[model samples]
Target: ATQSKPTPVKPNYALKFTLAGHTKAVSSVKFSPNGEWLASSSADKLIKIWGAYDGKFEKTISGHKLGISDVAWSSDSNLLVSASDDKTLKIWDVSSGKCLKTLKGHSNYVFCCNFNPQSNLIVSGSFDESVRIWDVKTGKCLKTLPAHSDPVSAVHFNRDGSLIVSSSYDGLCRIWDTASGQCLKTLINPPVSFVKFSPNGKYILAATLDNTLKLWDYSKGKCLKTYTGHKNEKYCIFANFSVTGGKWIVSGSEDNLVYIWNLQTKEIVQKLQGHTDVVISTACHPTENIIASAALENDKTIKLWKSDC
Candidate 1:
């Protein structure tokens, strides 16, 4: 049971960045690999580029006719891609603040997208129940995945760049080969909201509406374990094998808490309980021991927390 009133003190070194450009809840925020720029998307239908070190607005990349759902930065952070409820994925030149290309193919809301590591290929998932792979240079879809029975919510590239893992509202996680577009594995049973592969590409991590966290062996296609504790649906999940090979798992939930876990022991190491509302999005700091969450309930702000620092 949660304490009626947990200690109400906030951290000092880790500060909160209340990004003020968006009118509604922020949907996504991505950091450049070099930690220079921060790209964010919102229900207000705008994408803002900001200085990562000090939340300074660099540019507002806007052209979508409807609310944007997700945004991603290129591997090198030179380009930004966003998927919108307007049924399009837009590529932009971050420095120039210009829309370089508008990718149109989805019949419904484009829910998620990610650029392939070390390549110009882009893959997007949509409410139309398909995933499309695009060639960034020509702005043409090279492949479309039609196997999902329901809306695809998210997509991510595996560490080795050999496979793409996609999550769907169809209550399954699907893995596809990057070269052949063939279905490699279908993880059924858990009602997943998002899926991501570990940095080394050996394990798959999933968060579900079942209020459980599931980990799987990518090579064996079997669930390694299920973590249960949250009382509500998980919103986002990410895993990394840090220098210590620690199964560093971080997740946000409707329960308004961000959890850091040691998946190897199926134990939660820390519970970040500060958001006064539901956490709609959460991200583990790419190169640091920090985790950030965007709360959407009453007090909407981005809170950054830390562990192992």
Candidate 2:
């Protein structure tokens, strides 16, 4: 009898790393507000902060009881906030690697957290179907918004810092008045897997799991346009207004493509491809034309890109 043919083998990868240490998948990464530091969280229950350019490992935090899903830097970039499957939010002093405080109000996995630009108040979304606003300094839970029937995926304060926008898996993005917890409006039928406001707070961008992008005017709560060309879902996006204050939008998708869209022309300026796998996270450089992306492949490495436009 003929010998059975062997199955094809998977390809091995060699990664170029600027740093190391996460034993599992790195879920989220962000630059410090001043662009001096890089913060990353992993499924290994660790959060590491590094030098932005040199990739020097500065600190590693290991206090989370479970895998970390998301991380955020305070407006001043002095504090780091993290969320994990542990159902808690830990705010840390970045410089000292100390767990300064923990916010304990969510009953399920925390998905995302960010600081309000004006007041530096912490807002977090949870799989428990609520968004919690906390006082950054004291770690006190200030308010809990329970409108989302499904898990809240992302929560962000508006660019002007006057309002908060929370996106959920329920196909809605709700705008809230920060002080009173009043629901100002809800963008219904969003088809959105993710949503974020532009830096000017005049427009909002929504990326759908169906491989589409919609631009909406924030004040009127109407979809102005939609862009659909990718073969798979778009996972991450960031608004970058260049040094001269010119604006553009960068989106990374499952198709392993990074597209740069011009805000003024509403046209795709460039499509950047580097990763052989899904690009899970991306961040706009704070002071340059550089962009950063993390791959979800076996290597699980972070890549940086430089752009002149």
* Local accuracy of candidate 2 as per-residue lDDT tens digits, 189-228: 5435567777766877777667777788978978887766
TM-score each candidate.
Answer: 0.88, 0.87
Model 2's alpha-carbon lDDT is 0.74
Looking at model 2, residue 55 earns an lDDT score of 66
For residue 147, model 2's alpha carbon misses the true position, in angstroms, by: 2.5
lDDT for 132 in candidate 2 is 91
- Which residue pairs show collisions in model 2? none
lDDT of 1 by residue, 78-107 (tens): 888999999999999888888999999999
Question: What lDDT does each candidate get?
Answer: 0.74, 0.74
Point out where model 2 deviates above 4 Å.
1-20, 231-246
